Amino acid sequence: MEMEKEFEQIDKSGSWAAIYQDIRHEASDFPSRVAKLPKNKNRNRYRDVSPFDHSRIKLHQEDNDYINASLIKMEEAQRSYILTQGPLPNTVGHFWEMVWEQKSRGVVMLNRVMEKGSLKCAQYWPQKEEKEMIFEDTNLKLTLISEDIKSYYTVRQLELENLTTQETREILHFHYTTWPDFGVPESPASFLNFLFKVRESGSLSPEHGPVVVHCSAGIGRSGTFCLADTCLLLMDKRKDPSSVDIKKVLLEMRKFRMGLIQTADQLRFSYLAVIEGAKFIMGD
Ligand SMILES: CNC(=S)NC1CCCCC1
Secondary structure, X not given: OOHHHHHHHHHHHOOHHHHHHHHHHHOOOOOOOOOOOHHHHHHOXXXXXXXXXXXEEEOOOOOOOEEEEEEEEEOOOOEEEEXXXXXXXXXXXXXXXXXXXOOEOEEEEOXXXXXXXXXXXXXXXXXXXXXXEEEOOOOEXXXXXXXXXXOOEEEEEEEEEEOOOOEEEEEEEEEEOOOOOOOOOOOOHHHHHHHHHHHHOOOOOOOOEOEEEEOOOXXXXXXXXXXXXXXXXXXXXXXXXXXXXXXXXXXXXXXOOOOOOOOHHHHHHHHHHHHHHHHHHOOO
């Protein structure tokens, strides 16, 4: 079926939970043996969210190459994404090592450091220009260059230096700051505006390594971001945009990381975002 009318048909019939459970039943199951090794327990935020072995990002280190991060490679859309958990106190250095080694331009953050009165990820970037951060375990230096605070999101320019080679690179930090503590946003308008700002920066384009996207677990809000982006790109590429099947795209993405889209409300919100986003692209 088309999307917008499949949408109204699920609303009128109140069957979002049944649709979402079908997706969960059909989703791929692949091994994640490296994630479950005992030496990696303090590298995982949640015991039930792990990268598959076949698609995990490897750190360029011979001691321990493990990070909770997956490469989502979308062949028809010609986009790649790295989805990862929010960094932990003992993985902030690994996180920036990955950004460096994978040649990423942008980092997309969809959570606040504290939500619901608890810490959802480490304070992993500097908050003042004159107070830079040094990660001694991976030999990297990170400096805040500039910060632009808007009503729904903040964009930061950061300098990452490989202290071993003295090479430097500019990294863009795109921080969506207004996702509600419970539920999903009422309108997708500010999320779409944010997605378009990431796009306009070059961070999603083939001349750079894959964008790094995270929330707390790296599957829920993060899944919504890449699902909406890929679906809108396919609607632009194809002769028949109504042929884009969001459930099929989501199942393809779940071949590369488990659990993408965590609730039926997140599924409905993803439909809403793609539907509204397709009108703004045109032709309008
Ligand atoms: C309408 N069908 C679609 S969009 N099928 C898939 C979606 C994910 C990747 C390949 C095409």
